[model samples]
Target: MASMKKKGSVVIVGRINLSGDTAYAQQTRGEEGCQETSQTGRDKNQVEGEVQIVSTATQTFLATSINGVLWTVYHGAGTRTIASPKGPVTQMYTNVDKDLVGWQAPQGSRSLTPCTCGSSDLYLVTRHADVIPVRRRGDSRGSLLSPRPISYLKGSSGGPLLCPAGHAVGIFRAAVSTRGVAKAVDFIPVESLETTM
Candidate 1:
């Protein structure tokens, strides 16, 4: 996939291909999918497209082209809905959390290793488009944060966290800025994704 934009926790990643735009299937809660949110309306939000969502597993995912490429994230348990999808989208949901991965090392560790005392050279592709990838200097819980310059993270709640090594680090969840001045990310551990999925 080339890129993605966040909309609350509702993730819809698409890859621009040689032929046309291929929409990424979404991972959302069943109840949320049923209710009519901003862009969930199969009829209203969808332009001239087809979006299929299976409450349970829809066929076998591992068999599809997205098999190994699929990265899951924790869809926090709440009645809240993710920021509305602005365009066409598709979906599939599983309560099991596969927290998205965003690394702290410039070379996002090839694998998800436990965070130790030292810092890593991880970075993320925030709305800024990774123009100035943040140097991940901290790690904690299951979220990632950055400086106030990146405080515009409300729409990125479920965005994919990446490693410079072209690997996933975790999902982008909530961000907290102290006194509205500083920022950093503490995202879900890759190990957590392993445990949940």
Candidate 2:
């Protein structure tokens, strides 16, 4: 069984191959053939990717893709362990939400508000917790943009929000909307995955 302890940083055993735009799977003890395939596209070499255990609070692991996207692995409820041909089976976290944001409706559009997106009825591990208002560009009604400066959050989705100590802060979440050049959700920090892991 895969386990982790507090105090020490979680070491992710994986390699990023820029030429192939894939992450090479690191074989765990006893498993040789069981490897993970890379999902990144080639030609994006400047992007940095790495896998590490952000914290044990959630018993989960976070991996950053070449484009600075973040993903998590849950080891507990709402997850499944897949047996591999080479080594011990690894736990696969189901119900992945690609793009998510943190925002709460004040009064209007309460029912239309987009809750956490998930699959198989599994609740999303990350959500829009805080929100700020911003005036819409070139709008007369003065529309509000939830989670202001949504541009800063773009491409950051699935990326790691690290602390000064190098620990994960949170998974990148989406911006308010999908319109225009605004950034959507990005990283989902380790904090959100802790309870579910």
Candidate 3:
């Protein structure tokens, strides 16, 4: 059963290794409601649900996962596939054995790490309040993008870090420093994953 506390409500369901876990199946609901603050101000309340974990795996300290039951893999622009549930819904990942030869930790220091990305914000309409930018060495300037505020505390270590385009960019690592900004390490590219499709 899913937990009531938002923190442990969901779990990863997939393969496992030394790095991270992946997700495939997640619970969801339809859109709903609106609240009027004033004649000029109004807030629309959307539906919410748990981010069910369909599958996952870990290795080398990296991970990936999906929110829905299936994902479309696009290769070379015009090619794509609607992946079915052949196994666990999630796909785990890692980078411990992989080479970081040319990869500079985004920042010059090693303080930066990776972390999991989730959809709890979207479900709760608080994505703007909880999600934050992950820094490369815990430095604000070293971040991949301007630090975006988090909507909720859903993602954790060994989770997925998805891009705005709905693609897996990396794995969630940790929230270091005094501010607790979410951090993550780059892992698999959505484009490269398409090849496997």
Task: Please give, for residues 35-136, the per-residue lDDT of candidate 3 as tens digits.
Answer: 111111221212122211211111112223332212211111011111122211122221233211111111111111222353222111011122344433
RMSD to true structure for each model, in Å: 13.0, 17.0, 17.5
List lDDT for all candidates, in order.
0.34, 0.28, 0.24
lDDT head-to-head 1 vs 2, winner: 1
* Best model number under lDDT: 1
What TM-score would every model get versus the actual structure? 0.43, 0.30, 0.27
Error of 2 at 34 (Å): 14
Q: How many angstroms is residue 44 displaced in model 2 relative to the true structure, after the best TM-score fit?
A: 22
Off by over 4 Å in 2: 1-62, 65-70, 73-90, 96-156, 183-189
Using TM-score as the yardstick, the better of models 1 and 2 is 1
Candidate 2's TM-score = 0.30
Candidate order by TM-score, decreasing, is 1, 2, 3
Q: What local lDDT does model 1 show for residue 157?
A: 42
Model 1, position 180: C-alpha lDDT score:
59
Worst 10 residues of 1 by lDDT: 56-65
Give candidate 2's whole-model lDDT.
0.28
